[PDB]
Symmetry: D2
Subunit: 114 residues, 4 copies
C-alpha cells in the first residue's frame, strides 16, 4: 500500500475512525480527478487506499472530511475539511504516510516517506 | 482587521516572512473567487488583508505558498502549499486569526475566533 | 520583555486564559530555582514575566499548569502539566517567545527567538 | 507492550531513530525513579520499553533526548529535551502510545490510550 493515512483525535486520545477520505490526482489539464475514496477504520487508517498501479508520478490531493467527524462527537468544528497536497514519485517510487492530528480548532499534518 | 494570519518557521525559530498568501471565497457554483492577497511581513503577519465590508458570510480558503518559501531557503519541501478552509461569519460578525506553523515535511494550523 | 508566552486552546478556538505559569532556572547542582510566576491573561499572554537583568545565561524551564486549566472546563486532561526546557542567552542576549497549543490529549510548543 | 513511543522528524519526513528515551515513575516521596531506558529504532519506536509487571498505577515521565538527535543531523536544536508527564492506569490497566513530532524549534506530543 504506497499511500497510507493515520488520523488521530487530540481531544479524546484515540485514533479517529469513520473519517471520510478522498484521493485526487491533478490532470495534465490541471483539474482534480478522483482516484479513490475510503473511510478510516478503528486504528485511524485505510487499507488499499490506492493500488501501486494507479499511484503514478504526479500531484495528489488527499481530502479528509474532518467536519463530519467532529459533528459525530457533538463538538463544533472550525474547518470545512483538511486537504493535503503534494507531489509523489517525482524522484522514484516510494511509500507515503499522511499523518493527521485533529482538534476542533486545529489540525497538524506530517508526511513520512520511505 | 477581521482576518489575520500568523506564520512561523519551526526549523529556524523565526516568523516566516515573505510567504505569499491569497484569500478566496466560494461562490454558489463551488468556484473560488479571489478577494485578498498579501505577503507576510517580518513578524509573519499581513495587515489589512480584507475589510469587514468584504468579509461576508461564506466559505473561505486561505492559501499559503509554502513551497516557494522553503525553496528560497534551499530546503526540499514536501507540500505544494497549505490551504485552510472554513466557514466564517455564519453566527454574526467575528474576528479570525489563522495561525500556521511550517516545517519542510509538516505543518500545523490553528484558528482563534473572537467577538 | 525578553521572555514571552502565548497559550491557545485548540478545543474552543480561544486563547487559554488563567493558565498558571512558573519559570525556573537550573543551578549548577541541577536543582531548579524559581525566578518568575504569572497567569495568562485573556489573550493567553503574560506581561513582565522576567527582566533582562534576571534573565541571564543558563537552562530554563517554563512550567504550564495545563491540568488545572482543563479540569476547570470539565474536560479530562491526559498530562499532568507541560514543561518546556531550553538554554537561553548563550550566544548573547535574545528575546524568546514560548508558544503552546493545548488539547486534552495533545500539546504542541514552538519557540521564536529574535535579536 | 503497555507503553509505546512513536517519534517522527518533521524536517526530513522520516521516523526519528537513535533518540534516547528514559522512563521514570514518581515516588511515594515524589521523586523520579528511573524504570527503563532505550533508544528509538528505524521506525521511531522502542520495543519492550517496560514490562506489564513494572508498569503500575502512578505518575510517569517519559524523557526524550531531542537535543542529541538534532546535533546528529547538524541542525541547531532549541530545546534541551522533551519530557511528557502523565498519570497512567488511574482508572484501569490500558495501553499508552506517546507520539512525538520533532522540528529544531518545535515539538508536538499526543497520547493514544487503548
Ligand atoms: N502504527 C502504524 C500507524 C502509525 C503511523 C504514524 I506516521 C504514527 O505517528 C504519528 C505521530 C504523531 I505526533 C501524530 O500526530 C500522528 I496522527 C501519527 C502513529 I502513533 C501510528 C505505523 O507505525 O505505520
Ligand atoms: N502577537 C500576535 C500574533 C500571534 C498570534 C498567535 I494565534 C500566536 O500564537 C501561535 C502559537 C503557536 I503553538 C503557533 O504555532 C503559531 I504559527 C502561533 C503568536 I506566537 C503570535 C497576536 O497575539 O495576535
Amino acid at each position: 500500500c504506497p499511500l497510507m493515512v493515520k488520523v488521530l483525535d487530540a481531544v479524546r486520545g484515540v485514533p479517529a475512525s469513520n473519517v471520510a477520505v478522498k484521493v485526487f490526482k491533478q490532470d495534465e489539464s490541471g483539474s482534480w480527478q478522483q482516484l479513490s475514496t475510503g473511510v478510516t477504520n478503528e486504528t485511524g487508517e485505510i487499507h488499499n487506499l490506492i493500488t501501486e498501479e494507479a499511484f503514478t508520478e504526479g500531484v495528489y490531493k488527499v481530502h479528509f472530511d474532518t467536519k463530519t467527524y467532529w459533528k459525530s462527537l457533538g463538538l463544533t468544528p472550525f474547518y470545512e475539511y483538511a486537504d493535503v497536497v503534494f507531489t509523489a514519485n517525482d524522484a522514484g517510487h516510494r511509500h507515503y504516510t499522511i499523518a493527521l492530528l485533529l482538534s476542533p480548532y486545529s489540525y497538524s499534518t506530517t508526511a513520512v516517506v520511505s
